[PDB]
Amino acid sequence: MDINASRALANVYDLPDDFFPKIDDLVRDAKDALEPYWKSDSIKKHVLIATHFVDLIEDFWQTTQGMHEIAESLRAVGGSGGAEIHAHLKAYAKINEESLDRARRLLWWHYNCLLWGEAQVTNYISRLRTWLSTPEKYRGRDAPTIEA
Amino acid sequence: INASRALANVYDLPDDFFPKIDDLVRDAKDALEPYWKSDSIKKHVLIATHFVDLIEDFWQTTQGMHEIAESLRAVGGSGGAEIHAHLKAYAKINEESLDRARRLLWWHYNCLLWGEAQVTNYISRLRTWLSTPEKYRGRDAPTIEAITRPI
């Protein structure tokens, strides 16, 4: 495969939003794989970045989910609250969940690059892009995976 | 060792030592943009950039949560104290997270500009000066102009 075309086809924001493991499993794997580098106090790029995003998720994910739940409960219980309140709440939750989707994607990217290598990860992304462009019939019955 | 030490020192500060968030983010972006154009992977670059993004993403949402919670509680007739309590808890969590982000951003920005040593020494001196009981102190805090002068 052409390195150039691969790198051009590889981007973490192109993915379907269902390719990404649940946030709990992702955070757990990230922490369990980072513990050595933490204890060693390592200054590697992906270590630093994945640490930042682990912290970001742990901080704001449950708060955003609680905000969405609160907005729904407030619009359900009745109009006693208001429309501006629910609109502002939904907008804040929307912005936060966009930021959290970005954090999730980049945490995945950074963790997988730490494990395997960003070269392997971009190759995998390109090959998965192809697998997804192809129709179900003339492609593998199960998707690829890194060194798999 | 000394890294976590100076970090704990940074956390051991009064919250009135840290500039306003607008000034801080402005200065950080101004100092970092060249490094972005240069595609630099420096540690302080990595961390300050990511904290700037964090702040610009969540600060306004958190302040709005605070204000709307207080307003609807003053109203009193919207849902119940459950909503206000849930909102206060979330806002507290996000506030402490953003405070940590603000502090680490200050630390890394200043380390990048001037020097990690010049910032660590000043922070140690200031933390010591603040610890003491005001009778063995000096009567004049250490001022930030010490970072700017080399040694």
Place this chain on the structure above:
Amino acid sequence: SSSSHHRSPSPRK
């Protein structure tokens, strides 16, 4: 650097 890799992690497109 052939890759964008700006502001540290991969930049959007």
Place this chain on the structure above:
Amino acid sequence: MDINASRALANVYDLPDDFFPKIDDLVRDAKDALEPYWKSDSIKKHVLIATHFVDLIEDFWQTTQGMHEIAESLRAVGGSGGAEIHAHLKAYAKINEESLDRARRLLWWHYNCLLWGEAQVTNYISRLRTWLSTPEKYRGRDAPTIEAITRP
């Protein structure tokens, strides 16, 4: 200064009971500075002594405070216990408080000597005694310190 006069003016128990940080802060800083040596299972003087005194405080401080609380509560109640009971309890709490004050002072001493050096702390205490015997207006605006430094 004259090194002899410095070492002679340097004694931890000369300080007026308020130069010393609070007990929680002191134990916390001591543990934070010790845990490396604890893990490395070190033998050195200051580590050993600071550890012993941390343990002593952890063990007896809260008990002594509770003893004082008990003495005051029984004093308020009046009929409970009695007079000589209150007297003996207060005397015991007082002896324990003397021991714990000595422990706090020695803990400060050894923690700081471990961080910087007992010579540095000696000079610090000496210069502080001098700077503190002088009146306020001829002191200046720069008290004495140790001022750790870092090199890139």
Place this chain on the structure above:
Amino acid sequence: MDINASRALANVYDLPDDFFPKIDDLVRDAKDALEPYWKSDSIKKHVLIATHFVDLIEDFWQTTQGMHEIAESLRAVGGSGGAEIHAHLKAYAKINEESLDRARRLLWWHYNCLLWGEAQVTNYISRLRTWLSTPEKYRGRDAPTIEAITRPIQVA
């Protein structure tokens, strides 16, 4: 230190409590054997630890004992203001007793290691634990000892 010495000390922590000399005698002997190292201002592990533990005892032993005494006194006289009084007092005294028992045992270990040697003492304790855990009929009628004490001082 050696895992042998660690085993010996962990065993000291769990001995029958009748193996240990009276605290008065222990403190006395510790002071008398340490004052030379005090004058010489030595910084040896056992010296430091024994000194600190004997000071600890000197300070808090009689205090804890009087605490017990007065707790029993208030329980006997009655008229307590709530039972929490005696509860908290005896809990404090119990924590003090645990701390002081550990102190006595480490003082014993360190003073005896100073006298004889860490090796001699850990061997002694290994033998004594093997002897105590074992039941009679396979044991020996007389316990083991540090043979350097009860061996004759021969002089021509």
Place this chain on the structure above:
Amino acid sequence: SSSSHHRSPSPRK
């Protein structure tokens, strides 16, 4: 030319 420092720590005066 050494301080008291007896028993390992510093004594009173």
